[PDB]
Design a protein around this ligand. Structure first.
Ligand code: 6BI
Ligand code: NA
Lengths: 139, 128
């Protein structure tokens, strides 16, 4: 029922839906709690978004980061958007990466962008369990 | 004089100011056109920003990203925010990293005038 690029996202992996955005759990997370926030409209490039979509996309991203930071016991967050083919985008749909960070997770803080640019899978039940847990934070 | 963490930024290196945000050039760019977008209010963590500040900050980031992609002849952009110490934050102030990207780009400070030159160039793009 949800669109992510050329693929249909199962609802079970989505834990937030706004008027214009939505957040989903990752099939291959770089760290625990690595989630994605996207516009509901499938546009490839960040510059394709209207102003209200930009506001919604990142107000949502703000709320999602604070939730995943607490749930996965992080003390900081990495936000990253790979806006276009030459920045690592695989799925042709604007998406914001939200990663909880803990002291010592990467000995080098700058090696989490190597891992993001290289975007074996988690199970449907494992992903739906994680999303269902995160849903509790938004009521 | 603009405030970025504990640093006072000279206006000469700032190329955009909105009602709630401002953009400045980098003293230590990772690639050509690596710029920074910040709230005018010095808050350390992203969650401390009000909603109107979040919107303004990233509507600006969209504008700034479109400009640096053109000027530095990029074909994509990397947006990145190191929100907190365990995410790499050096300056205790929310800032979005905006980087023009080129095919094959990946696979010790700048001078004031070199930075003031770059800021002067980017300002022209917001003159319409
Ligand atoms: C049917 C269900 N499909 C999916 N369900 C959940 N996560 C998915 C996914 N397909 C791709 N992703 C992840 O989404 C990011 C793309 O991001 P980027 O283009 O590399 O910046 C990457 O981490 C991908 O692993
Ligand atoms: Na910072």
């Amino acid at each position: 029922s949800f669109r992510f690029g050329q693929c249909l996202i199962k609802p079970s992996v989505v834990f937030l839906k706004t008027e214009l955005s939505f957040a989903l759990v990752n099939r291959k997370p770089v760290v625990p709690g690595h989630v994605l926030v996207c516009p509901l409209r499938p546009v490839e490039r960040f510059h394709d978004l209207r102003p209200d979509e930009v506001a919604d996309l990142f107000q949502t991203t703000q709320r999602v980061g604070t939730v995943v930071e607490k749930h996965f016991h992080g003390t900081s967050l990495t936000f990253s958007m790979q806006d276009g083919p030459e920045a690592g985008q695989t799925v042709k749909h604007v998406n914001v990466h939200v990663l909880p960070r803990k002291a010592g997770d990467f000995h080098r803080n700058d090696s989490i962008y190597e891992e993001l640019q290289k975007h074996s899978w988690r199970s449907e039940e494992e992903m739906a369990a994680e999303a269902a847990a995160l849903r509790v934070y938004f009521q």
